Design a protein around this ligand. Structure first.
Ligand code: MSS
Ligand code: MSS
Lengths: 377, 377
């Protein structure tokens, strides 16, 4: 019954309320496509597993008294006040912030969790201090056994824990974010301080970060195992181990992998589903992205069910954690049509033609080839 | 100075001698493409790391007295005579047998190791007893901590060890091979008994198998670490972690993955490089394969540098560990042309447009898009 603006001060009233407690808001697709360069805080999706009491606003939060512990496998563990970061060199990164569960509702049969369509994604700029720059300023060196960064959320207001482990390789780009889109980081988006890992799924970008621990192993909390994992052959070159749709899987550390690197994807922004569009030359537009480790090589479109794929034009060629706009202009005769889009990156990653092959019981990492049916007048 | 037939009795004299000691023979490409359904023993490539004395023939070897130990994390370790397998249910599998290093010479700058072009591959049928069927017949159950199959070669004739670990998930298809292409398994191809893992690189298919050990960890031999590995983020969804070409990498268990699942690939068999072919309709032929876990979705060809990709026709649609033949008939005007081929499978795997992005100092897992330049008359 409450609208998004009543749950979170300053949110657009049209955001879809997937959950009140905890707070989960989805961007309507028509609103998402209206901001193809950068998703503003008024429409950016929300997914809390754990609400921090009083942080349910798009307004900034005070850094005053916000202490962060840095420990585990470092030579000299230390605590810093967030305000110290104001004096350190700052960097910004434009990145796709996407929920592990975005696309969940496209799996069949229905999976468990927030029933996202494609509105659990945004493209935003975070600004703050690189974690490696803070360690350098403090004169701290990582231990040889440090294989993970394990980030813990604040538990202020008697909140449950929220603990995520990412690979130590994420230290290269890890960012203590103080700002989003040039403004104070919204409280509801993890203000006053969020640890962001560019090119990693949203779950890993810990809002209200209070502890940063260098660990030899993945943390053993529920939020790390069995949740936020997909079936896999560990350290083998297959994106996931396909399973029978609808079957429960016995998740362990040794037969499943975490939601970490953002799955390669492309979204069609124009035309929209069921739209009538004019003339014979139809300009198909969208966005594409990967985990930012390598550049995209192509985004390709098919209007003949994959018999032929046509290279689209990309807005930029260089790799990015942020999405890249694309367009392909197709000659189409009047009547019903269907266009599909697929991304292809420099290490050969692409999208499955049938996204349901990735069926998993909590419905993570959907990246099936997007199809749009429309009419040419 | 010795020809292939002088190093290994019954090999075609035209095989390329890459190494005498140990024995490494490469199939010339024109000979490989001449057998597009099944590679015969007369032309099949050889790569020994460790020669077993007297096993340098295409002739079969006696099973008499060949004892295999099965141990580690099983309830009831046991030893069996290879001849026992004659009485057990047998299965056969057609599979791509490809060296980890196939394509090595296409990396730039030059890497270390056997300078394969594309002739370190064959498509063969192995027949014997599934390892899981032997465990079932013997009434043996795997321990909960069994995470690897660790296969040891015979050390008869004072030979050095050869020890490979694969994931326990490989138990599903693991095969104790007694025959190849309907004949006694050639001694030089691991007769009288070879443990084969369909869809895994050649290195893992241990010739002259003497011990099969279920282990909690990868073995710590030189042949497991640092050799036969590529840089990676362990348990993250990227086929490898790209590195600067020509730079030495500090391989460990925690920053690199083994050569395990066969990398998705496609080879163009017709036309051949620099060939003149007739008329306007050019029939491009080749083979494609992956690790057999999922079907291919398409093989696609481009004659315009990737601006458009055209779906080829596949010989078969069902998944296979063996290669699948494909053909695309292209309308081409007279003059110089270049055709590229790319495979795409059901989980979205494809090939990098520039294979050199995978540069690694021992030159493993090359799978760059193959290009063939030819003339249309
Ligand atoms: N602290 C914290 N953080 C955090 C959380 C919680 O709950 N808490 N969630 C997750 C998730 S889950 Mo799924 O994978 S997506 C997601 C994200 C979201 O973001 P935004 O809300 O800002 O949009 O966040 C992330 N982070
Ligand atoms: N026992 C044994 N096994 C074995 C060896 C040795 O040395 N030893 N080598 C490897 C390798 S390395 Mo590279 O990844 S390839 C390969 C293969 C081959 O096979 P053939 O010769 O039958 O073709 O084998 C495999 N196995």
């Amino acid at each position: 019954a409450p609208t998004a603006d009543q749950l979170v001060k300053g949110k657009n009233p049209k955001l879809l309320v997937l959950s009140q407690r905890p707070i989960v808001l989805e961007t309507p697709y028509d609103l998402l496509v209206s901001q193809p360069e950068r998703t503003p805080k008024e429409i950016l999706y929300i997914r809390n597993n754990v609400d921090l009491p009083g942080y349910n606003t798009v307004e900034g939060a005070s850094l005053d008294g916000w202490k962060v512990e840095v420990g585990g496998l470092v030579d000299k563990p230390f605590t810093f006040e967030a305000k110290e970061l104001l004096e350190l060199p700052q960097h910004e990164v434009t990145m796709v912030l996407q929920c592990s569960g975005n696309g969940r509702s496209l799996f069949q049969p229905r999976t468990s969790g927030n029933p996202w369509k494609r509105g659990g994604v945004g493209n935003v700029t975070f600004r703050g201090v690189r974690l490696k720059d803070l360690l350098e300023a403090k004169g701290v060196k990582l231990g040889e056994k440090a294989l993970y960064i394990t980030a813990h959320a604040s538990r202020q207001g008697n909140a449950p824990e929220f603990v995520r482990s990412v690979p130590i390789h994420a230290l290269g780009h890890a960012l203590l974010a103080l700002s989003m889109n040039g403004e104070p980081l919204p409280a509801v988006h993890g203000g006053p301080i969020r640890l962001v890992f560019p090119g990693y799924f949203g779950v890993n970008n810990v809002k209200w970060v209070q502890k940063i621990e260098f660990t030899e192993a993945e943390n053993t909390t529920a939020e790390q195992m069995p949740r936020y994992r997909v079936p896999a052959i560990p350290n083998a070159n297959i994106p996931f181990l396909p399973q029978e749709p609808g079957k429960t899987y016995p998740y362990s550390f040794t037969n499943s992998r975490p939601n970490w690197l953002v799955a390669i994807n492309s979204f069609i922004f124009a035309p929209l589903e069921g739209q009538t569009v004019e003339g014979p030359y139809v300009r198909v537009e969208g966005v594409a992205f990967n985990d930012g480790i390598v550049p995209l090589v192509s985004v390709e479109v098919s209007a003949n069910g994959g018999r032929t794929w046509q290279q689209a034009r990309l807005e930029r060629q260089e790799k990015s954690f942020g999405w890249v706009r694309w367009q392909a202009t197709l000659y189409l005769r009047p009547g019903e049509h269907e266009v599909m889009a697929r991304a292809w990156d420099a290490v050969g990653r692409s999208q499955p033609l049938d996204g349901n092959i990735a069926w998993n019981e909590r419905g993570y990492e959907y990246n099936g080839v997007m199809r749009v049916k429309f009419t040419v007048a």
